[PDB]
Amino acid sequence: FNKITPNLAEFAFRLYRQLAHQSNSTNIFFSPVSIATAFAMLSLGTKADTHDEILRGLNFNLTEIPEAQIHEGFQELLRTLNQPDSQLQLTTGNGLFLSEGLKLVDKFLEDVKKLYHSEAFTVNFGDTEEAKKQINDYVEKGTQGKIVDLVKELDRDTVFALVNYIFFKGKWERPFEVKDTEEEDFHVDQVTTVKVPMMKRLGMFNIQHCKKLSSWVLLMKYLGNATAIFFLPDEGKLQHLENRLTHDIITKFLENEDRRSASLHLPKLSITGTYDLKSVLGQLGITKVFSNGADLSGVTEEAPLKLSKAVHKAVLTIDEKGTMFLEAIPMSIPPEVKFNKPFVFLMIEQNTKSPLFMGKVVNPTQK
């Protein structure tokens, strides 16, 4: 091992804190892993400063970690996420759309399909409306209709577009009962509430109040190789929570094997996040691959090339089952832990400890 996990975690937090500062009003949900994998794969077609800018933007110190170890970590991670036995029910995809007039390098197309198990297509960008249709049809087919009309605009000068999508519908190892789901208040702020569907269950949870984070920290395992970590900040401590989050704090939580009783209230969630990666990753220092000076000679040898379009959409559903453990609950008052106010969450792949998803819910029904 998990050599690149600390870098992915730092990239995840840099990405989250930028999105959180740009809008303090919207639900956030994105996949650090899928974004970093897409651009680690893209770097194979870049050289020199364009290449170095991408790997540094993904929080890799190129003077300390060899590039071979970087790609080994991503391919090893893509391995655990894409195996036929996975109960994770995780559908991710990366589509590369290149102008049909370009002479493509076979090494790049081979590395993209073989090493990173991604898809590359040629498209007539002279027909902008038909190019957008083929791109959106690919994403809609890849998500069985979950993501429709991903791309809304394409510039006329587009010759290279990247789409990265990921859809997650997890199944809890210890599920909620549908009969127990009821409408409850969600405190969008200290004086305002909205009604949301709220799951609840009495059980033995990996849960604790953390004075360091001023938050309740709930960990719940999915069927498969992933764990959801929910952070419920104390009154007025949301910003304090986001500032303190580090990878080492996450690791300590994952190692805890203690369970305690609690009456958990957790909202049903169906949230999405759509991000312009050119704008977003440009704030993280990745700019040259999107500019006219881009060194994409690994993709096409003769003609100039730049990445004109890059979009990420992540979709999350949280419900009671997602599709027979008996827990012993003591005769004692369990704390009432209600996720009925803005909270942060992370999904962690258990093998690599990599951050599959990161997000914040400010309002479950603001769809």
Which of the listed residues 301, 321, 341 is the one where a domain comes to its end?
321
Both tokens assigned to 60: 């890799």
Give the CATH number for residue 229. Answer: 2.30.39.10
Regarding whether 179 and 103 lie in a shared domain, the answer is: no
- Three-state SS letters, 180-198: HCEEEEEEEECCEEEEEEE
Regarding whether 85 and 1 lie in a shared domain, the answer is: yes
Regarding whether 333 and 288 lie in a shared domain, the answer is: no
β-partners of residue 275 are 312
Looking at residue 80, its amino acid is T
Both tokens assigned to 146: 């979950």
Regarding whether 65 and 10 lie in a shared domain, the answer is: yes
d(CA 2, CA 80): 12
Helix (H, G, I), strand (E, B) or coil at 122: strand
Domain count, the chain: 2
Resolution of the structure, angstroms: 1.9
Domain extent for 183: 173-267+322-367
Q: How was this structure determined?
A: X-ray
Regarding whether 335 and 295 lie in a shared domain, the answer is: no
22 and 358 Cβ atoms separated by less than 8 Å: no
Q: List CB contacts of 52: < 8 A, sequence separation 6 or more.
A: 62
Query: Residue 280, Cα to own-chain centre: how many angstroms?
Result: 14
d(CA 273, CA 280): 13
Q: List CB contacts of 174: < 8 A, sequence separation 6 or more.
A: 201, 203, 220, 221, 325, 327
Regarding whether 210 and 345 lie in a shared domain, the answer is: yes
Give the CATH number for residue 302. Answer: 3.30.497.10
346 and 15 Cβ atoms separated by less than 8 Å: no
Regarding whether 18 and 94 lie in a shared domain, the answer is: yes
Q: List CB contacts of 141: < 8 A, sequence separation 6 or more.
A: none
d(CA 157, CA 301): 19
Regarding whether 249 and 143 lie in a shared domain, the answer is: no
Regarding whether 166 and 60 lie in a shared domain, the answer is: yes
